């Protein structure tokens, strides 16, 4: 309740406009109306003549045309008239999607399929299902400004994507995957919003001016009104799961979600979800445990959270990278305990934020985390989106791959990653005001040096994937993905860390695992038989002695 | 560590300068030295020439003198030197102050005595003993700026106010009252600093910019060094502990505090406390129970808290009162639900912010929340701090009174209030900055109407008390004050309660009490013998029916 409502024959339109004292209905066929204030601020009005899938601009007092901000679909530009759709209205009590098969793809539909649509999109899933994924995460589809963006501007969380084909397509989307088994995960943005088409602004107070986020300013969960905005977001979850049968939510850096509130509008969110049965996810820079945290810890709840930590650990000890972030680790220590602690940081200085960072993860099992060696974030903001591929040596590459995907943790695999893609992530933007189109540049370019003007095709489509299959790379994918399953390896925490100066072995419920990044002398306390390799050096029956390895990772049992 | 440290012969400086490339030890006597810049900012030195109660100012990089904000003691103006004192040292394992027994006395060093100060304050101790008072709370007593302030303009956490006597004269009232077998409450401000004097600003950052409270903003406690700051404060509440033997902090609106963290600064302090085994009590607006909720609640454990909550209900009955947060209540209903569920906001909208606010306290004992029909905000920000005597009918104001001491929560006296004082509370500052005195004035102009130009001592003086007393209300308080004791009314919140129309009657674990605003009937459902009456239209032995009466309290057995 705050878009639309169509009854019978009969339509609502429901309108947050504390600061309005007069509001205008405005079917742009039809005609315009005047909406009943009430006193909590919401205008409104009933309608019948209308079924019409018509574009209509809510007009306010200051003379002003402009478009619902629950608009179901912005036909035209974030400055489109909002418009009419169907009721989508069926989906079910479930989602088939059990959290230990969990095998993420993060996808970006524009530069993906060349197509870059849903449709696009849809033509993969049996590729998809090949790889053996175990479900898709889309990347933010909220309407932002232009047809060229990550999708972090966008501006109208309940309208569903121009370009990338919208509704109906997105619709089709789901049910696609759904027929083909595959489970689908929106990403969506409650921390912040898009600086174009923003017309909250003039609505009301939508957004807090207590705190100040980095990407402007949350939302106000806190003060005044905070009542209805902290609806505002609750129902836009409902909606998708009703509205178009999703199966989870990822949610973007929760941690410029600010809220005082005896109740944490998270843990709001989580029970939403987990009350349709669907699952969460969170960005979380904050090594903090109460996200993931359970109800009896007093914890919001949110089924999962990315653990960059992971990362960077491995990243910058086969990259000889120490840039921001990087300078917090850069080393193998960091790797195994990230691999036995979640966290790194768990409570411990990082000089990076010259501060105390995070705390002990509890004893919560693996999949409380998704591990990556890659995502749109990390290839994304580089200044030239290198993909790993770029800064490794072949067999680290491979050797990485089996780390992340050979974890308790919940496994995700960037796009492109799986087959050996070397294009890269660019920060591409389509915004059209001037000063955006510009402080932009200054930014990426200050921020990351990032010289591809992301307001340009280029910047754009340089970042299209070229479907170049490397059948090397790709076939390992697959199979460590199927070893996985077949090992039972997720969740399950429960291993045993070694490692030598270069070398590390990990002892697990159903194997080992042997990671030498430097040809070196091992004393293999096991004998298994090899299961996988990334060279041929590897002895398909091993036993416990010293032995010499060269680069390379292999797997037992 | 963070002012000066006197070893043996020898003395440290310690001083967190981030900001600063080069600082300067400066003995005013003596001479100017050089800091030892730590890498994480802090500069220092060593000393043993000194002994000398010297003052000293830091001069930094831009080639200014300042002087130590962990200041011991300011001996001159806020802009004094800071100075060398003694190390005080000791202090005991404990606080008499058992928190049932807990009878607290609001006072304001300044308006008090007419000395004003901690020796005049010491003349009353027998004074408040007799009384019956359980403990003392002084109002904030950290360096402000001039002689004339509330004392909310604190710009010297570590600095004993000059004016009230200062260091030893604190020092004495401490170890005073601790004969006279008093308790005393020091009220320390965290969430905020004085407008004059503070030089935190350039020594780096002590104060966050992610938040803005009213009164400028907090300080830092998750961002970029917050490790530091998060220390001053913590070490400033052992010192007060063992510098000063105190006896238990209060709080200023901790709401204010801002904390991310996995671990909230409260919770952090309250360990402190609790650490020496000391009280602690906070001044929340937060419906919320987190605070003085316990551990194992995950609770950040402060042992109480304020409930204004109480107050108003029972002030806007009393009076026809409904301006800003009057509005919320004003009504009867409102002063049972608080008598019987600490919080009339308990998860409701208050349309005085227009958001839910509030939720459920526990299973908590009274003993968790202090309630009080007076105290310097009050009476203070009125306009023209009128006394609560001022705007009830004589019976009232000792119903009222009744009503407060009478609850299983912890009773606290406004200063003046027992013996009847009529003499107002007035907002008075003691700025010097042009634009400060200047602002203040259209700001209490503007808030809340105050004409008494608070940089008058005529707004002062008059706030001053006049020791005038009453023996009618002064008899009664004492009397309630022993009656409670005696009763064992304290904590307990298994209390049965009625109300007709414009009566009230609240059967306890050892009495009953009955209110009546307005001759009315009542059908007195018990039988008792008049305890203590605010009439002598009471019945001596009381029992069960109907029975006319007359507005007036009187209190059974």
Redesign the interface.
């Given at each position: 309740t705050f878009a639309y409502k169509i009854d019978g024959n009969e339509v609502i339109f429901t309108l947050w406009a504390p600061y309005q004292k007069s509001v205008k209905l405005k079917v742009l066929e039809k005609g315009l109306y005047e909406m009943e204030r009430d006193e909590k601020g919401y205008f409104t009005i009933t309608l019948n003549n209308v079924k019409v899938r018509d574009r209509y601009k809510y007009v306010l007092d200051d003379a002003s045309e402009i478009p619902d901000p629950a608009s179901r679909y912005q036909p035209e530009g974030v400055h489109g008239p909002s418009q009419i759709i169907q009721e989508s209205k069926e989906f079910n009590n479930e989602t088939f999607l059990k959290k230990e098969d969990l095998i993420i793809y993060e996808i970006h539909v524009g530069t993906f399929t060349p197509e870059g649509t849903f449709e696009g999109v849809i033509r993969k899933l049996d590729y998809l299902k090949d790889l053996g994924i175990t479900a898709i995460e889309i990347m933010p589809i909220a309407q932002f400004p232009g047809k060229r963006d990550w999708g972090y501007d966008g501006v109208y969380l309940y309208a569903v994507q121009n370009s990338y084909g919208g509704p109906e397509g997105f619709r089709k989307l789901v049910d696609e995957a759904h027929k083909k088994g595959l489970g689908v995960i929106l990403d969506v943005v409650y921390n912040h919003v898009g600086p174009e088409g923003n017309y909250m602004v003039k609505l009301g107070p939508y957004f807090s001016q207590?705190?100040?986020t980095p990407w402007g300013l949350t939302f106000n969960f806190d003060?005044?009104?905070?009542?209805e905005v902290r609806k505002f977001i609750l129902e836009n979850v409902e909606y998708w799961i009703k509205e178009y049968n999703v199966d989870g939510f990822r949610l973007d850096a929760v941690?410029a979600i600010?809220d005082?509130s005896?109740?944490h509008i998270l843990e709001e969110i989580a029970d939403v979800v987990h009350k349709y049965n669907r699952i969460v996810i969170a960005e979380s820079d904050?090594?903090?445990?109460?996200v993931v945290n359970p109800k009896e810890?007093?914890g919001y709840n949110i089924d999962a959270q990315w653990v960059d930590d992971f990362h960077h650990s491995i990243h910058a000890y086969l990259t000889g990278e120490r840039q921001g972030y990087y300078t917090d680790f850069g080393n193998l220590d960091d790797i195994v305990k990230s691999y036995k602690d979640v966290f790194v940081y768990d409570?411990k200085y990082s000089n990076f934020?010259?501060?105390?960072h995070?705390?002990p993860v509890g004893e919560l099992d693996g999949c409380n985390f998704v591990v990556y060696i890659q995502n749109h974030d990390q290839v994304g903001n580089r200044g030239k989106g290198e993909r790993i591929i770029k800064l490794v040596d072949r067999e680290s590459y491979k050797i990485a791959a089996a780390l992340y995907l050979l974890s308790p943790y919940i496994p995700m695999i960037f796009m492109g990653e799986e087959y050996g893609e070397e294009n890269p992530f660019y920060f591409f933007s389509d915004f059209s005001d001037s000063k955006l189109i510009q402080g932009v540049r200054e930014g990426r370019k200050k921020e990351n040096g990032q010289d591809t003007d992301p307001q340009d095709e280029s910047t754009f489509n340089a970042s299209k994937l070229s479907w170049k299959i490397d059948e090397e790379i790709f076939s390992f994918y697959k199979i460590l993905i199927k070893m996985r399953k077949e090992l039972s390896i997720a969740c399950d925490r429960r291993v045993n860390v070694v490692n030598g100066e270069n070398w590390l072995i990990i002892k697990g419920r159903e194997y080992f695992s042997l990671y030498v990044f430097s040809k070196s002398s091992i004393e293999v306390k096991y004998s298994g038989t090899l299961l996988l390799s990334s060279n041929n050096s590897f002895p398909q029956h091993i036993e416990e002695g010293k032995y010499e390895f060269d680069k390379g990772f292999a797997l037992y049992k």
């Open positions: 207590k705190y100040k003060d005044a009104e905070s009542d941690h600010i005082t005896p109740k904050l090594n903090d445990p109460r810890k007093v409570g934020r010259r501060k105390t995070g705390e």
